[PDB]
């Protein structure tokens, strides 16, 4: 219990040397502020998962077929037992229940396994357990589909934490994104539970495409919700009434949560603006050249923003301080490369419906080169005695 008592209490220490007064900020407050910022997205994601599942279930089955389906899945009969209802007229509470029955087991598994690995490493190397794993665990739990198996979540958090982060030294001593590295482990290794048509609506027997997969097949006319029967307007993808990953769907809630940590100085408005610039430039160029066979060549810049996991990655995952560039001039190039590669993998890569994590991994590989270019340009000034 004393090990957790390090979290509840301040350390109660004094300074030893030159700077006798210290700033009020620490790493704990930064990590908990980034952890609290994704709560609106988490809650709307649970709500949307429940609502999409209920809609798809009521579209397929009716009457006596519904009962045999809700008595077959523990999510459904546990909602019915706790108090909700799986009928077509369920309120906002019966949908958040069904979304929590999907999200909370994944979050629990991810947290437990990642914390086990982190405590193991910190014990073996005689350190203190660190925050900043809260962020990794919540982001990994929020960037996966609702129908992911728990053993795959365990394997993925193990890979993301041990290999990408803990092997290199811990928090602040790695060069890559742990959450995206774990998610990339599960996408290339077991790629049928994280792709296709049957993994994004947690309904039993429902096959339905997303929206960056309906756009690639037939354009903006092909954006129709089969479960309900109506078109996916722009305000649907912006607000978030679209199927997809758990906590990515609501661009409005992501903006509401990211404006705070951008105001506070924790996230980088330079990287965010760079991502936006790269996306707008490349999407406008594609719209200018245009194509006949490829329907993604005409997706505007404001459709790229609300579809897929672009906003989530731009706000919370592309602003990682350790993986990004350490120079103000390099952060712009980092963001521009992220946006450019995202749009490129979206449009001209046929096998992946999006590339918002492959882009970030590429930019993680190439950020130290931008820092090197800028610092080598800075050294030439100092040799000329003007800096």
């Amino acid at each position: 219990y004393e090990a957790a008592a390090t979290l509840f209490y301040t350390p109660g220490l004094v300074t030893k040397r030159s700077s006798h007064v210290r700033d009020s900020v620490d790493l704990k407050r930064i990590m908990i502020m980034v952890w609290l910022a994704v709560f609106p997205a988490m809650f709307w994601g649970m709500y949307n998962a429940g609502g999409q599942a209920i809609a798809a279930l009521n579209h397929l089955y009716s009457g006596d077929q519904l009962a045999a389906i809700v008595a077959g899945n523990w999510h459904y009969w546990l909602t019915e037992m706790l108090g909700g209802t799986m009928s077509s007229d369920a309120g906002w509470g019966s949908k958040m229940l069904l979304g929590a029955t999907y999200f909370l087991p994944i979050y629990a598994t991810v947290f437990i396994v990642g914390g086990f690995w982190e405590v193991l490493f910190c014990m073996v190397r005689k350190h203190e357990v660190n925050e900043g794993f809260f962020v990794t665990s919540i982001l990994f739990a929020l960037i996966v589909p609702p129908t992911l198996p728990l053993w795959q979540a365990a394997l993925g958090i193990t890979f993301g934490v041990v290999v990408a982060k803990e092997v290199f030294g811990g928090t602040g001593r790695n060069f890559l994104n742990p959450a995206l590295a774990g998610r990339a482990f599960l996408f290339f290794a077991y790629p049928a539970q994280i792709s296709g048509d049957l993994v994004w609506t947690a309904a039993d027997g429902y096959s339905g495409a997303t929206a960056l997969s309906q756009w690639a097949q037939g354009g903006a006319g092909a954006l129709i919700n089969n479960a309900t029967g109506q078109t996916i307007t722009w305000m649907d993808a912006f607000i978030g009434n679209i199927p997809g990953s758990i906590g990515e769907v609501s661009t409005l809630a992501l903006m509401i949560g990211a404006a705070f940590i951008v105001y506070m100085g924790i996230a980088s408005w330079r990287i965010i603006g760079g991502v936006m610039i790269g996306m707008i430039l490349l999407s406008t160029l594609f719209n200018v050249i245009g194509s006949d066979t490829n329907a993604m060549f005409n997706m505007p810049w404001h459709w790229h923003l609300v579809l897929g996991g672009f906003a989530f990655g731009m706000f919370f995952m592309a602003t990682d301080p350790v993986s990004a560039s350490f120079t103000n001039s390099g952060k712009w190039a980092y963001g521009i490369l992220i946006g450019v590669m995202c749009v490129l993998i979206r449009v001209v890569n046929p096998a992946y419906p999006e590339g918002m994590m492959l882009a970030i991994l590429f930019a993680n590989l190439f950020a130290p080169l931008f820092d090197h270019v800028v610092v080598e340009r800075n050294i030439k000034r100092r040799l000329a005695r003007y800096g």
Partner: protein
């Protein structure tokens, strides 16, 4: 111009000589501690590959192609020895030309030339060329692009390894193990261009 740009971009990004094809991983993983040395070695590799691939294309199409010399003869079993001989001889002659005629460029990039006298990347480039039956211009462009991709990859690895002066690596993983894991993560990142059929 539409067909030669495609080959350049493909050889640079879609099929990277180092991270996609795994050619030259010994010097890649050994000589990549400093961005300076990695840049020099990448430039040397670019030059040698660009000079080597088209000459082997000429020799193949002139002598070693089936039925090229006389009708009914096939000398394709001399491919390996002819390629390795041409590569080694070109590397040595380039070393001597740089050492005598141009001392500055020799002190710049010739220092790395004894390493890539017989490297797997250049032999694999020539082998892929004889497999894909490129013309002379296609061979020039493919060699240039492959060298540029190899240089980009090794410079990125050197930049990462220089950023990792702040890390705290376990003792058993210090050096070679962590370099292997780093190159693995770099390949995981470079897997972005998998589906692009350019």
């Amino acid at each position: 111009m539409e067909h030669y740009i495609s080959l350049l971009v493909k050889s640079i990004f879609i099929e990277n000589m180092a991270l996609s094809f795994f050619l030259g991983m010994c010097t890649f993983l050994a000589v990549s501690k400093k961005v300076k040395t990695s840049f020099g070695l990448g430039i040397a590799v670019i030059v040698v590959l660009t000079i080597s691939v088209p000459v082997n294309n000429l020799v193949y199409n002139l002598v070693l192609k089936p039925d090229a010399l006389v009708e009914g003869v096939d000398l394709s079993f001399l491919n390996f020895i002819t390629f390795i001989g041409v590569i080694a001889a070109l590397v040595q002659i380039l070393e001597m030309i740089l050492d005598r005629f141009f001392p500055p460029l020799y002190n710049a990039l010739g220092i790395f030339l004894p390493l890539i006298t017989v490297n797997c990347a250049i032999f694999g480039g020539v082998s892929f060329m004889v497999q894909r039956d490129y013309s002379f211009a296609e061979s020039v462009v493919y060699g240039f692009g492959s060298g540029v991709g190899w240089m980009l990859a090794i410079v990125a690895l050197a930049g990462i390894r220089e950023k990792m002066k702040y890390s705290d690596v376990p003792p058993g993983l210090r050096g070679l193990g962590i370099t292997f894991i780093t190159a693995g993560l770099m390949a995981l990142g470079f897997m972005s261009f998998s589906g692009v059929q350019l």
